[PDB]
Design a protein around this nucleic acid. Structure first.
Lengths: 262, 180
RNA sequence: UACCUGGUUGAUCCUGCCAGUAGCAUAUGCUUGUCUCAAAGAUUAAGCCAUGCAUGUCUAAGUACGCACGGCCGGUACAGUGAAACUGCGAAUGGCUCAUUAAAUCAGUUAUGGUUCCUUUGGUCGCUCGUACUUGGAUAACUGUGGUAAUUCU
RNA sequence: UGGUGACUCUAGAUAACCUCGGGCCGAUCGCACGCCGGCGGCGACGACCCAUUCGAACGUCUGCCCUAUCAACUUUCGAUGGUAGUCGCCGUGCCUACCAUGGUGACCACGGGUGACGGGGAAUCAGGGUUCGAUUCCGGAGAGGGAGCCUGAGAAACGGCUACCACAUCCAAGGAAGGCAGCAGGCGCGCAAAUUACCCACUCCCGACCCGGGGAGGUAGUGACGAAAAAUAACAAUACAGGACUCUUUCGAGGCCCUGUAAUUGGAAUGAGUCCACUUUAAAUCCUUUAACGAGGAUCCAUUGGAGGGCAAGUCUGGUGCCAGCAGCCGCGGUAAUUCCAGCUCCAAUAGCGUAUAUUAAAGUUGCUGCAGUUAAAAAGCUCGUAGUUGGAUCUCUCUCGGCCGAAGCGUUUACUUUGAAAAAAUUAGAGUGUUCAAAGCAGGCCGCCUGGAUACCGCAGCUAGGAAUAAUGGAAUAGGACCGCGGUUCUAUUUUGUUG
RNA sequence: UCGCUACUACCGAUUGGAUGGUUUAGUGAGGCCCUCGGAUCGGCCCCGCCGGGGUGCCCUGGCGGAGCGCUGAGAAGACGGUCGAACUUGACUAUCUAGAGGAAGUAAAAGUCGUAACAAGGUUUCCGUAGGUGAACCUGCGGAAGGAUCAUUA
């Protein structure tokens, strides 16, 4: 082509958006923003497809244009604004609050959350650089730059952002024994304790993780998000606890859970 | 670009040798016994059996403690018990290979309308289904090759709008009542 | 469903090919009552094209002295709705086709510590020691006078 | 100061420069209104630089069909490399000057061809394979053929411009305007392919924008490409010089079960149509739902090929007489034709069935699995020989640190094997789900709640970790060999002398 | 060995014509870059007719004029560079096209002379190689048995 693409076909969309085959040729094509377009959920899919508030891609316009929707505490009037991981969606006309966390199957989830928790979010530190008369900066995975960080914040750690002010409150460092969520790959949405981190200089670090049932897995280092210090998550978790069931016992859960009916 | 799906699938295979006696004879006996219309209704039920034998014959090379054999093999027997072809005590993966065409043809809605006595012949069941006289639990079923599941066998009846079960007479009885 | 069958000789056993057989795709013939999906000027000519349409755009928030409407009140800078034109932005996407092209394209895998990036999101934006309670000149739309057989010409 | 595996990085300091074709440091719009002439709160536009997002570009490794009647190519004119620069967003013979004489080639370069855009995929298939992939997704290219630009973040842009070559429209003859491989439509070509229809309601995109626009896209029309479901009748009473079951030695006795060359009788059932209404939709249609009409040669008739063998099914009758013609092959036809032309009857598939051509299986007739070579097609006249291919036995984890448990090193290097993580979606396989079944779909279910939208497969090449059999390879043979402590020569760390030379 | 009708392709005179692809040489539209150029458009001056303010002098308002004044903006056009479509003529070709002559194989042939071969096929046959003919062929040399001998006597 000559210059950038503005459309997204539907079959070429991310798999986790769960758009069906026969509704159209095109998919919502996320706007440029804090998140990669493969790693995000546009606001039109959260309102029309997941929450079933809207029914067409004109009612999402009519909802967002009444300024009823705050994404990380700022009002968003773009329906294809890419909301990504750990983003807080506050709808104040109804009274709900959501956080975008992955579930055990590699998609996002409708995770309703308490407005006492919706005042903060976690971010992962991505590059730390000095400059401009010797003033240090962070860059997180939301492109949030927070100048003057704590000197004990390094790369691959986790900060906790206050969402009304933009400032760091307290952090977690990258160590063994910390509770982490995988945000990419085939182990995506899984929660476990960091066991081990193997270094491959000139290539990617591999971080072996251990479940709460004993299921060990590994990822590359970039798909690792430190959620808690020790084993206590600093955010809430979804209905499943980040623990992937194999399909046999995932069947057993259904064929035993239907027997509570009557 | 279009929002259409072109995913289709043929549901039968024709034989390699077209004029073979005792293939012709056996399929004609299965056409006459079960009230079917043409050869393609036998070649269709031969094809779903050949898909079930083939998938079990693949699953028999993996060992008994395979993940895939234990999951997908228990889900193959579950369907064959569910439609009433297998029984419940024969749920090893090797009584699949002892299934036949007639086990699958006894579960059509046509032969079940004949078995329950709502018809009086196997060709009387084809018309009584096709004239919309037969319902399954609430729903008028208009297709004779509707494979009746095991739980839906106790609810097969006479379709409350019909002259046979419901009571408002047809086209012919009312005209003869007009000429009375 | 891991398959064969007719054809060389007076008869036989072979080599071996012809011929049948079954899909699948393009054409085509004869026929065609219902109902659900569905391809469709690729192959030959990346041959040639009448006519029409396919790319435009205004919020409270750049520029309103069009009475084009109407509206207070008539010294009230500008009530308002607003065509036009200036300004901004897009038109580089989408659609179509397969002529080129044989380590080329492309696929997987890496690299930019060898580079640009409208936009979006976050940062930064009294960090410089040296008429402002607001600066200057044009130009459309408009009015008015024309040219050319003829153009989204001027 | 902070960093990476590694900076000539990021910051800091100093001396200067800073482009008149100038580098930022706001002469901008709106809404509520104010607090003590000042101090104001939310926004909208801007904006150098940094980061991010969306990309783009240029590279790394590995991989592709046919051809040797293509065996040497590249190098004046850049071919391979070195130095200095020019250009360019930047790395580079990208280009220029001066040098060096190199670079690729049986492991098939170079040249030619392709009825070659490449992949994801599709057909067939025991296992191995073979062939197709223009075609809706990703990537490339191109707008009649080459070439050059303007604008802009982005174009060597063609629903932009300037030329030239090729066509071609108007003209008052001076001039003017072109580009359907967009949607329709036309001509031509051909074996070969649909409407100059309706709409922005859906899916999304663009814009100053909740408002406008979109032949993108959706909806209809044509459509036996192709795939799914599926009518063309069912039933009962009689009768048969029909069959079967109980008795009679047998004649023959029966609603006990079946059958029909009964155009025998008889009502009961129903769509196809015709058609009000609702529903569907942007508005319509179609299907679904319902009025009313709607079947007895139920004329509301089912066709396409065949009846010698391959191969299901008539040496029946009439005609023709090696003619006409049939026949994929074998064969048929010369006066009795099982084969032609027909009538009857029968067979096969059945709303479908013939024919032609491409291709796959059959083909173990291309053979890796897995063929052949005395006589059927075939072992070179003999020998030497480089590349290739193939090669006999043999050999049973530790040092400096942190809290015995982790770093760091290995050991000679690999092939192999097993695990891991990374591998677009759609397709394929496969789980769940009564689309009325099914092909499909990604839905649904319960009396506001409860769900699902799994998973496998994803060659070769590249990462990772365990194994150590097999197979290649090293390790000392004139010991300039291992391990030890002994001495010399050269360079040299940065702590040591309260700071200070 | 020797008689009839037609096609395929090549040679094929004709220095028959028309068009591609590679290069030799010459030419070179248009854009861009450079060096010039300077049609026009301002501005600042200087006087002249003159107001006010301050105090003969300075700043202001209307103009007017002239100067090769001295600066800013700038069109046409040219030199040179570069990119490069294209044109002209040669060579190598390749392809579309008109023409007597003859050439080879193909469709059959049931037409005439011998009888080469298969029997010891009436000269066993076959192989290579040289020579001669109406021709199947014949002959000189050297093989083979696929021979008509698996054998011939101290």
């Amino acid at each position: 082509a000559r210059g950038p693409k503005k459309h997204l076909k539907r079959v070429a969309a991310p798999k986790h958006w769960m758009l069906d085959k026969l509704t159209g040729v095109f998919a919502p094509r996320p706007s440029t923003g804090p998140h990669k377009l493969r790693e995000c959920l546009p606001l039109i899919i959260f309102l029309r497809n997941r929450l079933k508030y809207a029914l067409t891609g004109d009612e999402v316009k009519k909802i967002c244009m009444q300024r009823f929707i705050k994404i990380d505490g700022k009002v968003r009037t773009d329906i294809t604004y890419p909301a990504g991981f750990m983003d807080v969606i506050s709808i104040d006309k109804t009274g709900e609050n959501f956080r975008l966390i992955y579930d055990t199957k590699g998609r996002f989830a409708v995770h309703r959350i308490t407005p006492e928790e919706a005042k903060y979010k976690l971010c992962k530190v991505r590059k730390i650089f000095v400059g401009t008369k010797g003033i240090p900066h962070l860059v997180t995975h939301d492109a949030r730059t927070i100048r003057y960080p704590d000197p004990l914040i390094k790369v691959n750690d986790t900060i906790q952002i206050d969402l009304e002010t933009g400032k760091i409150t307290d952090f977690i460092k990258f160590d063994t024994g910390n509770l982490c969520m995988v945000t990419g790959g085939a182990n995506l949405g899984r929660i476990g304790v960091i066991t081990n981190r193997e270094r491959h200089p000139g290539s990617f670090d591999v971080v072996h993780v251990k479940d709460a049932n004993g299921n060990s897995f590994a990822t590359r280092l970039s798909n690792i998000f430190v959620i808690g210090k020790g084993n206590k998550p600093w955010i809430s978790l979804p209905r499943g606890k980040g623990i992937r069931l194999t399909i046999a016992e995932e069947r057993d859960k259904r064929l035993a859970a239907k027997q509570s009916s009557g | 670009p279009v929002a259409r799906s072109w995913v289709c699938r043929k549901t039968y295979v024709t034989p390699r040798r077209p004029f073979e006696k005792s293939r012709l004879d056996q399929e004609l006996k299965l056409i006459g016994e079960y009230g079917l219309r043409n050869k393609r209704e036998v070649w269709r039920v031969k094809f779903t059996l050949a898909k079930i034998r083939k998938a079990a014959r693949e699953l028999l090379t993996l060992d008994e403690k395979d993940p895939r054999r234990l999951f997908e093999g228990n889900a193959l027997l579950r369907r064959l018990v569910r439609i009433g072809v297998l029984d419940e005590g024969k749920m090893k993966l090797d009584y699949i290979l002892g299934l036949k065409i007639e086990d699958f043809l006894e579960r059509r809605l046509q032969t079940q309308v004949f078995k329950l006595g709502l018809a009086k012949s196997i060709h009387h069941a084809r018309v009584l289904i096709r004239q919309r006289h037969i319902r399954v639990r609430k729903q008028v079923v208009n297709i004779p090759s509707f494979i009746v599941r095991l739980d839906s066998q106790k609810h097969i009846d006479f379709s409350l709008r019909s002259p046979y079960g419901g009571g408002r007479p047809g086209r012919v009885k009312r005209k003869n009542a007009k000429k009375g």
